[PDB]
Amino acid sequence: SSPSEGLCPPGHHISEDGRDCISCKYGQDYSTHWNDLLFCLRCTRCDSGEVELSPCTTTRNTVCQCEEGTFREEDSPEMCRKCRTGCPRGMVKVGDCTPWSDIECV
């Protein structure tokens, strides 16, 4: 309700005047640190190729993951990507398929 010591607690944003704290709307937005933000951050909506590992709260932003078989990375945040089923000729499985990489063959 009060901004404690000039900040608003996690899961809240601060008003313009800075006299009152306001809670984020569970499921639509969130904030994680004590803050003086004019308004809360929008929750990340999982893609169709992704699963929701953890749902969005006020205090936390949803965590999404690539569905079994796929992975992602910095340059491919749009659509998760199929792992390769195996290696080429004269190369072997070293690293597995994860939600964050391809298999690695050497």
Partner: antibody
Framework: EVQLVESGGGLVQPGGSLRLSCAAS????????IHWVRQAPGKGLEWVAS????????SYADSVKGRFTISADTSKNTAYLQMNSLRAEDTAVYYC??????????????????????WGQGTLVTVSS | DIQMTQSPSSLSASVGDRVTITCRAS??????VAWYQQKPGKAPKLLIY???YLYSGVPSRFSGSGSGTDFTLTISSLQPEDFATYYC????????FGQGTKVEIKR
Amino acid sequence: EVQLVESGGGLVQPGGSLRLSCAASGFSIYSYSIHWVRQAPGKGLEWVASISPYSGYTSYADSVKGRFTISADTSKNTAYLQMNSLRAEDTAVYYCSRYSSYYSYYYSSSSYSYAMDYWGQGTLVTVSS
Amino acid sequence: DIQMTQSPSSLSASVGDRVTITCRASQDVNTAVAWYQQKPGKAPKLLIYAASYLYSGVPSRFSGSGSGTDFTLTISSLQPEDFATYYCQSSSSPYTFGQGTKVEIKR
């Protein structure tokens, strides 16, 4: 007089480190928020990163996440931007900037604008072999 | 993910003309847009903050005047020295600037 002299820009090889340094004088970096924002030659502005020492909070842009790291040393009253695995696309003039929040008010009794209200002169970074 | 869209990308106006640069945010941002004047070589300068507030020391001829999705910087008696690129920026969220609007002085 407030000013934010930055330093550290210059020529880097692709896939290389480059630390920018934003030296704040005339005020206390703590109670404020310091954002870096960059501009590719002849093009518009693009916010890179932010850091608010009063809370501990950092945010970055996605076109820079996991490569760039923002930091700040109240003792030295500077803010940094460590730039790693640089690309040709990162070449720009990087600006640092003071951002008046409200804790700005609670702390020093500033006037806040919830905007970037002082900008450093900017150093150029060019990434090319 | 917000996107600030300015209009126009460029204009020509004569000294003493009234210039009007407008800027439309893709999502609603309350009154949380700022406006910046950037001149060649120099770093951006904040003119209007909050949407309609004149930043300290800026000339009164600059006027910010929006709320919601649509926002309108009005340069009033355009001067020789107002040749500059001008950006509306959603502040509070991600800090998306607009593509910029380019004013040049007709003579």
